[PDB]
Amino acid sequence: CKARCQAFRKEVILRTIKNHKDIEAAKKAVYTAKKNAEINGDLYAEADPKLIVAIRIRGINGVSPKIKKILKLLRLRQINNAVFIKANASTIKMLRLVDPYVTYGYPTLETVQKLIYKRGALKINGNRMPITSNCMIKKALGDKDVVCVDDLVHEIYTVGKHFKEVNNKLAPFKLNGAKIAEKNKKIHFILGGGFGNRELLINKLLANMI
Amino acid sequence: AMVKLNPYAKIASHKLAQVAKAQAAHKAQYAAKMEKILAAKKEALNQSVAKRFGVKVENNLLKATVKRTAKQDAYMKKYDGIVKANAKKYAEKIGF
Amino acid sequence: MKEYYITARCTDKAHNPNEIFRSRVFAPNYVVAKSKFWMMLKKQHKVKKINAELLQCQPIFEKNPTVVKNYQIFLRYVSAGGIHNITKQYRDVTRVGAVRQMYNDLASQYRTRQDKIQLISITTVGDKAVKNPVLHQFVGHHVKFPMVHCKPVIASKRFNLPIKAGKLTTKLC
Amino acid sequence: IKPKIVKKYTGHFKRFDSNRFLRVKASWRVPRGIDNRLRRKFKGTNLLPKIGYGSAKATRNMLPCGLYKFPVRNTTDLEMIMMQNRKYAAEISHAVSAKKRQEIIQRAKILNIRVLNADARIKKQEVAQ
Amino acid sequence: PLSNGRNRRTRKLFKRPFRGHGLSNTSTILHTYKVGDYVTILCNSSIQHGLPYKAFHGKTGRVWNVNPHAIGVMVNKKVNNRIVVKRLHISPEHIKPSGCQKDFLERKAAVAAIRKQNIQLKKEGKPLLPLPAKRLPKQPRPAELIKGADIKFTTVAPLKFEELY
Amino acid sequence: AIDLDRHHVRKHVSKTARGNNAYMKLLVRLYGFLARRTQSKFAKTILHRLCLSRVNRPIVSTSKLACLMKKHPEETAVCVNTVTYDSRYPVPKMNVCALKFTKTAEAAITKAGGKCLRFDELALKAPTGRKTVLIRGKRNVREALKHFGKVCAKKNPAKQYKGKQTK
RNA sequence: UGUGAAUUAAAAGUAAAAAUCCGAUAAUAAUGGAAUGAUAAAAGCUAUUUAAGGUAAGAUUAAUAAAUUUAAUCCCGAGAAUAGAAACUCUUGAAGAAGUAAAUUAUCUACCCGUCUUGAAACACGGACCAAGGAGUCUAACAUGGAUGCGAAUGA
RNA sequence: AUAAACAUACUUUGAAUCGGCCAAGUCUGGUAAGCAGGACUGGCGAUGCGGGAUGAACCGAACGUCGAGAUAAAGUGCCAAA
RNA sequence: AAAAUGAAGACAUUUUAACGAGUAAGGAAACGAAAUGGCGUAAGGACAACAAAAGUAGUAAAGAUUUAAAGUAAUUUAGAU
Structure with a gap:
């Protein structure tokens, strides 16, 4: 049995x-x-980061048509939503285009673990079911050789062969609210603002948001 | 739920129990050593404050509290030379 | 304010990949330090981030944050009229400690925000090399002054009562 | 056994401007005016019926006593709720006479069915009796 | 407010290239166009007979029919909220071979050359070579080590302002 | 809020027999159970076609049954619609399952030696579908389809609803 | 003659104590709560067995060392098998509990409805108040569409 | 590369509408205009909520009925929570 | 929306997930897993104590005035006069 x-x-x-x-x-x-x-x-010379985590900062009102399409192709359709993004010349340009509406950076392994373990979910039969067992992960991603949540974490963090198929199954995370910036979210993080590339400092923001 | 999702949690928790317990013993025995090192330093101070009384002072009033071997003592000198070079090599790098 | 040591190299047709650009950048965090560093490369050597590799970005800490030193910050800033070069002296114990004074002083006397100031260099001058009329009065060995009109100090917000009892007195201190 | 009946809004949804004019009754009517204060949900006046106010399906239409209502017009009507006396409650109709009400009340006690009009249309046995 | 003439607003569009007037090449009329080819419509104002409409200039189309003096070209046009199929007949003086698939035709030959050796390798029993890797966006550069003997250092600092007058 | 492409509206697929016909409702229950339990694409096809409207369930005549079944001798035609009789041509021997058989069509199949089953007998004999030939009638032969569009069109003109002074 | 940034020798020091600053971080934990729940056994937890494992770091010793270097023997030990345990208190209420309604008070909150208009609370028009009456109906032709009957026929 | 099965392609029948107004690291006429007219986008109209004391358009953010928590714009002597 | 179940329970079935602002305008009836769900006025045809006296009514109808209850609401229900 x-x-x-x-x-x-x-x-x-x-x-x-x-x-x-x-x-x-x-x-x-x-x-x-x-x-x-x-x-x-x-x-x-340390190797360039491969994984990027982006969060939608601004709402849905008053967005240009080209910026609106990109945020849909990145699955950032709601404020305070986090997704993982493969880093290459194609995606880096796209993130620059939607810079005023997102903040992103390079996540550590502990950030990936806590995001998946606490806010993780999968799209199964069109239903956004939160992760509750490895049997639900084996059914979802059996043909992609991902059978356990740890295997899910490792494939995301190392950006393996089946990242796209694994990443597309993960629903975009829904995060809480946190102090976005020092001045306000109307300027770049370099100017003390809220949006833009935070490099490794996105983990501190994600810590208060998870 | 963590065990059900991650059966490896039980193994990793045990090692974290070991590490926390072991690092507590190591901290206790270092504070015991540094208590004696400070104990030697305090006596080396009261003895040599007699410069108040009356004046060059003695050179070796601090007494060893750890008995080590000669091979280690030579290595202690070698390691000291390394850190002086590293501190000098690093400082000139930012000296421009 | 923190000081960083940043290096990079350019790997393309125009630049040989055997010449390293170093810098000492004062920035609130290392992301801003790289942002300042890349601008100096692009505005002075046509080196862009997409054709360059960063090598090291390390914090620089004060060697002796217990010794009082006189600094001399050479800087250029932009006004309504044009662009000028200034040399302001500061007394502090850390290189980053004096820079925050310069930024706060420029934004007050000259009303110049931080995104108009470029710090060319910062050195340490002698005791007699100070020329600031106010700062020159405290460089001597026999400085002495009584702090009058002292406000009585409270140990913490714990005893900060709104209404007190009796009378209020200052301190000759 | 009886669950906790929760009402999301215990007040009454009164028609707009019904408190100022006597021709406008208090029965609710959605304002369709192009400039209406209420239909634009202004602060202070933004109270309109919605499906969100609906009470829980389990405890809907349930009387405070914990049972439902089942109107009866004669004794034979009671026989339809004798298997569910823990679920329903007899409620004699308003036109039923006093002579017929005794027969219903007498029989409903036999069948152990609660009657919510047990003291309805009673005789003058209140003073000097 | 413009007029609705056929060739309105063509002072610069229909001008000849600087020092490019007169007769065209001989390759233009000697190039062989076959059905399914990709061509570019380029109105040659030097030849006013059969000049294609100015809205098709620079568009890339496909050859759909070869006639004795004209080459049929099929392009796409945009209308109120849809797209329609436009079928034109253009003399070779106004079209030009398109290089839109030049890069794709290079990968097709590289794969075909590899596949030609595999049937040889499988015939002789040797393991067969793999097809060329797919194109990817510029990937993050890996970890690299720079030797410390052939390195020079250039110090970078903000420059002291100097007057340009 | 959330930025969606569109809001959820009712899907435009029928999932039950239209109307109050008690027998057609029973057939939907019978094949809704078969499609769900047997999990066969055939029972899913019959269940989907039983829920189409009358205009979407066009008739098939004995002439088309004769031709489609020519190379399928030991087979059972399955058409979810009325089956009419083409009096112009002979009716061979064949077993046909259909919603309705015209009086003249049933007598032509029966006399030739065939069998006119209904959709409950077919589910009894071939529930998952084993000797079936799925058949549906033409949809574009309707006279309404001629008049759809703009008759002034240059490519495929419409057919000009007739009226006052239609020369 | 005194101070002395910095540097140098010797003693001590295996280079993890404590405090403050500077960097770095935020999460595992412990103790008190808050909102909405649940109450019963556990893929609980605990005890006994063998033993995958402990990648700076479970311990110690050895060779040596600017080492997340290499060994040795001790410890703990996941899986699995065998045995383990939760059924409670006090206060108030037919002398009116919990809830609900009405009236008043207090804090917060609230511009005249309908209409044309880019835009009305408008110094734009109609409206003093109440009751009753009050405005997409019928006939005829065509088309589409949902249910229906019959089907090269249908209606009669 | 990325996203996409309540995807995609539609077919038929039909309603209302074509007085518009505003903003701007935009332009043309004009001395200029809360003037007249345009290119691209976002809004108001059709839209309430928190902030700018008050305001159709500004800033945050778009609304089923609620409980608790971090937040946004922006604030922290009193009115006024800090 | 998708799975599960289904001659009759019942709350217009059970579970999971997403969603819910709005002028002009649209969503006729019926359609068991129902191609939006309902309240009210009057009139016509039937049904209304299943054992041969079969809905309520001079042991008090309709109406009116109020008190409470059910429903998000349109409204309904009952008590007293």
Whole structure:
């Protein structure tokens, strides 16, 4: 009967060990290279970020038609909505176009974990169901070799082969309110404002928003 | 719910229990050592305040409290030379 | 205000990828420091972010934030009329500590907001090199003055009563 | 056993301007005026009926006693709610005479059905009796 | 407020290229157009007979019919809220071969060359080569290490203002 | 609020038999149960076609049944509509399942040796559909379709509703 | 002769104590609550077994070291198997509880309705008040569409 | 690359409407106008809510009936919550 | 909207998810998983104590004035005079 549940349980454990090995091993290699570059007097250029998290800051009223279309193609259809975005020349230009309406940056692993674990959900049969078990994730993304929520987190964070199929299943997160800016959300974050690229400082804003 | 979603939580929680417990022991034994190091420093101060009485003062009034080997003592000197070079190599980088 | 050390290189046809641009930028956070750094490259070497790699962006901390030093900030700002170069001296214990004084002083005396000021350089001058009429009076070794009309100090907001009892007195302090 | 009956708005939705004119009755009518204060939901006057005020489906049409209403005109009407005496309650119609009301009340006690007009059209047995 | 003439507002549109007057090439009338080709309508004001309407200048179309002196071209036109199919017949003096698929035709040949070797490799039993990778937007650059012996440093600071007069 | 492309309106698909006909309502229940339980595309097709309106359920004559069934000898035509009789041409032997058979059409099929089933007998014999040939009639042969459009058009003119002085 | 930014020697120091500043962060936790609920067993938690594991960091020692370097033996130990436990108090109410209604008071809140208009509370028009009457109906031709009967016929 | 199955393509029948007004890192006539007329977009009309004391258009944000919490524009001597 | 169930329960079925501002204007009746749901006025044809006396009514109709209850509302219900 339900002897497969233990078989399912162990398999999730085995993948979790594999997933954490990949993230830890890749992180270790960066430190070793930085350590050796300093010894040899070289210069080390860190790799550009691959994952971007964008949040919709401004409402739905008074938006240009071209800006309106882009925010729909990024699934930022509501204020205080977060999505993950693959970083390339195509998407970076799009985010610049809608800069006054979004704030984005590069998330850490703990940010990705807390977003998926607390505010995560999937689109199953047209229904936005929150994540409640790995059996609901195995059904949703079985053919994409994602069977557990940890596998979901690892594929998002490392931007794997099936990011697009995995990302499109995740519904855009719904976040709470938080202090957006120092001055106001009418200027860029560089000017002390609210919108624009926050680089690694988006994690602090997401901490108060999750 | 965390266990149901993430069966690995039980394993990671145990290690976090170990690390929190172990790092508490390490902190306790360092504060015990630094209590004695400060204890030696205080006596080295009252003894050498006698410059008030009456004047050069003695050079080695601070007494060792940890007994270590000669191989480690040579390594302690070698490590000290490393940090002086690193602090000098870093400072000149921003010196422009 | 925090000070950053930023380096980058340009990798395209026009620029050889063996010359590194360094800077010491005072910015509230490292994202603004890069934003200032990229503008100086684009406005002085035609180097754009899309054709450049950043290498290091590290904070710089004061070596001795317990020694009083006299600073000399060379800067240029934009007014209604034109563009001018100023040299203002400041006394503080940190390089970032003096810069915040300069920004707050410029925005008060000259009514010049922060997005009109470019800090060319900041050095440390001698005790007799100070020329500010007010700041020159405190550089000597025998400075002394009584602080009169002292307002009595409250330990914390805990004892801050709206209405008091008796009379109120200042302090010769 | 009886659930908690929650009413979202216990007041009455009175027609706009009904308090100023006697020709305008208090039965509600949605204002269709192009300049109407109420239909534009001005602050202070923005109280209109909506589907959002509807009470819970479980506790809808339920009398405060915890039962529903089932009008009866004779004794045979009671026989339709004798299997559901924990759910319904007899309510004698307003035109039923006093002679017939006794028969309904007497029978409804036999069938253990509550009557909500138990003291209706009673005789003059209130003074000197 | 303009007039509704056929060739209104063509002082600059219909002007010849600077030092490009006179007769055209000989390749224009010698180029062979086949059905399904991509062409560009470019009105040549030097030839006033059969000049295409000025709204089709610069549009890219498809050859749909080859007639003895004219080349049928099919472009798309935009109307109130729809798009209609326009079928024109244009002499080769007003059209031009289009390079819209030039890059695509390069990938088609690269794949076909690879697929031609695979039937050879599968025939001989050797493992077969993979097709070329798909185009991607400029990706984030990876981690790189810069040697410390061939590096020079240039200090960057705000420049002291100098008068241009 | 939320910025959607459009708001949810009722989907324009019928999911029940139109009208108050008690028997057609029973058929919808019978095939709604079969489509849901057997999960067969055939029962889904019959259920979908049973809910079309009368104009969308055009007739099929014995002539078209004869031709479509020519290379399907041991087969059962399944048409969700009335079956009329084409008096011009002979009726071969065939088993036909349809909503209604015209008096002249049923006698022509019966005399030739065929069988005129209804939609409950077919569900009893071939519930999932095994020896069925799905058939539907033409929709564009309606006289209404001629007059739709602008008759002044250059490509496909309409047909000019006649009236006062229609020369 | 005194102070002294900085630098240098020796002692001490394996370079994790505490306090403040400066950077870095915010979340795991503990203790008090608040809003809406639930009450019963657990993919609870605990005890006993073997043992996947503990990637700076569970401990110690060794070789040495600007190491998230390599070993050794101790500990804890996830899965799984075996045994474990929750049924409560006090106050008020037919001397009127909880709720509801009416009247008054207090804080907050509230421009004249209908209409033409880009725009009316408008110094734009109609309206003193109440009752009753009061305005997309019928006939004829055509078309579309939903239900119906019959079907190369249908109606008669 | 990204998004898209209550997607996409529509078909038929028909209503109302074509007096418009405003803003602007825009333009033409004019000395100028809360003047006259245009290009692109967003609004008001058809729209309440929080802020600008008050205001059709400005700023935030668009509304089923509610409870609790972080927030937006913008504020924190009293009116007035800070 | 999608799944599940379905001759009759009942609240116009059960579960899950998204959604809910609005002038002119549209959404006729019927349609079991119902192609919007309902309230009110009058008149016509039937139904209304199932055992052969079969809706209410001089043991008090309709109307009127009020008191309370049900419904988001249109309105309905009952008490007293």
